[PDB]
């Protein structure tokens, strides 16, 4: 039965991908400090298989951790496009979510979702390191629910 085989292969590729999320070493402002605390010993993101890698070529997740300005927007889009696929975007904190404290400024992008597609929004200013971790585990469960091979089988 192909349905059974593709279902199990979906679980494997999904499991491999959520178990090995490598965020891009990419942070913008104060939200990036709480992201540092998620890597720090109390939360130890690395224990979930979540490992920062500087090169976009070797990253699976972009965590937009801070305010995105108009001057920075093209560079953020550039390094997101240079991520191979599958790739995911986590929006962290009010600034990245929708502009936040600087929403009405002439120099700020009102939410990073105007520039890139976003999989998870983590609320807070900043979200606590635990809140960000909750967002990463929420991303993992979203990847767990993906049905790439089951949909291909029924195409």
């Amino acid at each position: 039965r192909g349905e059974y085989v593709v279902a199990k292969l979906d679980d494997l590729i999904n499991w491999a991908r959520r178990s090995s999320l490598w965020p891009m070493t990419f942070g913008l402002a104060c939200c990036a400090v709480e992201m540092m605390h998620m890597a720090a010993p109390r939360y130890d993101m690395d224990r979930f298989g979540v490992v920062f890698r500087a090169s976009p070529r070797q990253s699976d997740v972009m965590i937009v951790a801070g305010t995105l300005t108009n001057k920075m927007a093209p560079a953020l889009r550039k390094v997101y496009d240079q991520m191979p696929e599958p790739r995911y975007v986590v929006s962290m904190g009010s600034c990245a979510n929708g502009g936040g404290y600087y929403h009405y400024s002439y120099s700020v992008v009102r939410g990073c979702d105007r520039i890139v597609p976003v999989d998870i929004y983590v609320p807070g200013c900043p979200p606590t390191a635990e809140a960000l971790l909750y967002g990463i585990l929420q991303l993992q469960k979203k990847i767990k629910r993906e049905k790439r091979l089951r949909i291909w089988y029924r195409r």
Binding site: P56, P74, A75, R77, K78, V79, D81, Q82, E85
Partner: protein, 115 residues
């Protein structure tokens, strides 16, 4: 034949892994994705532009010193000679001259990189 087989297997295995890597995943190729990486901004100038070598003199000295080890590597075999008086003198003479050559390049500021 064993050596040739072992080499062929190693590089065949590596080549197969690269074939899988390119034909297994789902691709989505477009211009911006494959553009060169420079931290989010476009590069200024080609990466093929000349890249000055500040250790150029040590690199040339490496060629001469790299050849000295080819003269010295036979020393374990030369120690099996009955003519040990000559062999020891010549063996020390070669190493000393290498040390003198290093000392000269050192004192004359040849090991310092160009500023």
């Amino acid at each position: 034949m064993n050596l040739m087989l072992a080499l062929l297997t190693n590089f065949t295995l590596a080549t197969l892994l690269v074939i899988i890597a390119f034909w297994l995943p789902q691709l989505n190729v477009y211009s911006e994705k494959t553009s060169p990486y420079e931290c989010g901004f476009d590069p200024m100038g080609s990466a093929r532009l000349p890249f000055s070598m500040k250790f150029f003199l040590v690199a040339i000295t490496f060629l001469l010193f790299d050849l000295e080890i080819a003269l010295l590597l036979p020393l374990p075999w030369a120690s099996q000679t009955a003519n040990l008086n000559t062999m020891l003198t010549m063996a020390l003479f070669l190493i000393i001259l290498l040390a003198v050559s290093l000392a000269y390049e050192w004192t004359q500021k040849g090991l310092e990189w160009t500023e």
